[PDB]
Swiss-Prot record:
It comes from Saccharomyces cerevisiae (strain ATCC 204508 / S288c) (Baker's yeast). It comes from the Eukaryota. It is found in: Cytoplasm. This is Protein STE5. To yeast FAR1. The gene is STE5. Signal peptide: none annotated. May be regulated at the phosphorylation level, and by the mating type of the cell and depends on an intact pheromone-response pathway. The chain holds residues 44 to 67 of 917 of the full protein.
Length: 24
């Protein structure tokens, strides 16, 4: 589950946007 450190995803949840909203 969090053996990944998704707390980081928070940053991508904010930066991954680059592709997170490929059709926004």
């Amino acid at each position: 589950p969090l053996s990944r450190g998704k707390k980081w995803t928070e940053k991508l949840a904010r930066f991954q946007r680059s592709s997170a909203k490929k059709k926004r």
